[PDB]
Amino acid sequence: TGIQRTPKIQVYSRHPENGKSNFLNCYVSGFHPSDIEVDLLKNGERIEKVEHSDLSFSKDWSFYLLYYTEFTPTEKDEYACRVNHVTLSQPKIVKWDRD
Amino acid sequence: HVSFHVIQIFSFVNQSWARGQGSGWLDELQTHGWDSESGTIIFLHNWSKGNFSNEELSDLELLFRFYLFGLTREIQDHASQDYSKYPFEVQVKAGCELSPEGFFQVAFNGLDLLSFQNTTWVPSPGCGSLAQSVCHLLNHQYEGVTETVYNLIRSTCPRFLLGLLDAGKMYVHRQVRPEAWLSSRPSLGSGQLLLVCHASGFYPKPVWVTWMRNEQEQLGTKHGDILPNADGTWYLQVILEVASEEGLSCRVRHSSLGGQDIILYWGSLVP
Ligand SMILES: *[C@@H]1O[C@H](CO)[C@@H](O)[C@H](O)[C@H]1NC(C)=O
Numbered sequence: 001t002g003i004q005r006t007p008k009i010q011v012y013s014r015h016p017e018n019g020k021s022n023f024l025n026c027y028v029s030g031f032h033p034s035d036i037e038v039d040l041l042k043n044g045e046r047i048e049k050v051e052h053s054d055l056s057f058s059k060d061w062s063f064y065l066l067y068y069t070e071f072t073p074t075e076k077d078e079y080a081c082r083v084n085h086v087t088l089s090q091p092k093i094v095k096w097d098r099d
Numbered sequence: 100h101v102s103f104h105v106i107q108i109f110s111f112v113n114q115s116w117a118r119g120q121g122s123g124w125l126d127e128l129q130t131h132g133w134d135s136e137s138g139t140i141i142f143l144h145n146w147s148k149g150n151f152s153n154e155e156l157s158d159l160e161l162l163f164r165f166y167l168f169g170l171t172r173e174i175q176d177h178a179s180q181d182y183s184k185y186p187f188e189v190q191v192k193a194g195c196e197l198s199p200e201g202f203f204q205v206a207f208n209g210l211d212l213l214s215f216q217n218t219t220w221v222p223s224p225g226c227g228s229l230a231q232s233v234c235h236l237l238n239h240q241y242e243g244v245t246e247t248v249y250n251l252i253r254s255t256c257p258r259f260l261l262g263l264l265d266a267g268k269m270y271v272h273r274q275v276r277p278e279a280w281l282s283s284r285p286s287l288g289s290g291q292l293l294l295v296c297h298a299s300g301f302y303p304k305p306v307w308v309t310w311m312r313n314e315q316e317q318l319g320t321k322h323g324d325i326l327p328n329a330d331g332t333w334y335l336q337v338i339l340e341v342a343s344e345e346g347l348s349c350r351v352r353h354s355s356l357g358g359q360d361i362i363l364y365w366g367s368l369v370p
């Protein structure tokens with residue numbers, strides 16, 4: 001007798017230039033339970049040394065975390081956020097858009 | 100409006116594995132953290148001490164440590180009977196908003212279980228059998244606890260929160276001007292492009308990113324969630340779909356900008 005919510009992945013940059021150092025943010029919202037696996041990707045490879053939030057939950061008790069790594073973007077580079085959770089049948093890759 | 104509170108997460112995986120984790124919050128602003136393993140308060144900011152003596156805070160840190168461990172200890176002791184009810188998660192939200200009002204909300208599997216009203220532990224109207232059982236033991240069996248919880252939310256929390264606000268005076272009332280830009284993105288439609296208007300790295304959270312088709316403000320854009328940045332600032336993006344070259348702009352209104360609002364023009368205008 002409880003709740004199961006699927007994570008809401010949201011990907012963005014701390015600032016808008018190639019070669020100029022930035023921060024990639026992956027914000028995972030409203031999920032049940034807390035057991036979550038959030039990964040950050042550089043051309044599909046799991047980015048190591050990536051800091052994150054202390055787990056917190058919204059008014060409605062759904063959890064949330066902000067994931068971040070100091071990154072330097074380039075033309076040929078593809079950045080995305082891979083999240084896997086009990087509600088998810090297979091991981092969810094969410095691409096960071098640019099242009 | 101002034102609300103300080105602690106949050107606790109008690110994750111109960113199996114007969115043996117069960118962990119606990121806390122945080123110290125001043126609304127959206129995190130002020131404290133909890134070393135789950137060691138049982139040590141983490142003061143995130145310079146002013147996280149507030150006005151409280153370290154002899155105080157240590158005794159507080161201590162009481163928290165005992166409780167963070169004991170709650171798990173006592174929970175796994177009851178769960179030692181029905182190894183089927185595994186896994187499950189307990190959630191705690193408790194503090195005060197300053198006459199001043201205190202609180203203690205509890206959730207099970209992300210659904211209100213019980214509350215602390217005056218000195219009575221009151222079941223959330225719904226799952227009776229588990230709540231009524233817990234509430235009973237809290238109201239009539241664990242003797243110290245109720246008075247302590249009462250004291251923490253009504254005597255300590257208001258005393259602390261007042262201190263913390265006078266402590267973080269500059270940081271809590273700081274004004275961070277937004278970094279705003281435009282962006283193009285292929286829409287799903289033939290001869291249709293998306294117009295992303297960004298406003299990043301701003302604080303306090305209340306912001307107003309609006310797309311204008313020349314004169315009028317256009318509702319019918321894709322407003323995002325005001326999202327967090329590691330630094331403490333906020334981020335917002337509003338998407339406007341346009342057909343193959345449609346003279347429009349983006350007005351950004353933030354508390355920080357001195358009565359002025361940022362305007363961002365996409366391409367050419369034709370008056
Ligand atoms: C309990 O769950 C943990 C995962 O959190 C697992 O590593 C461990 O093997 C489990 N133990 C038992 C006895 O089920």
Ligand SMILES: *[C@@H]1O[C@H](CO)[C@@H](O)[C@H](O)[C@H]1NC(C)=O
Nearest residue numbers: 216217218219220245246249
């Ligand atoms: C709160 O409960 C106490 C008994 O513990 C009682 O004396 C007091 O009058 C009650 N007040 C309210 C507002 O219910």
Ligand SMILES: CCCCCCCCCCCC
Nearest residue numbers: 174177178189205207233244
């Ligand atoms: C095993 C059922 C979950 C028990 C949840 C206990 C929550 C009560 C919090 C108040 C203790 C001070």
Ligand code: NA
Nearest residue numbers: 242243245246
């Ligand atoms: Na009591």
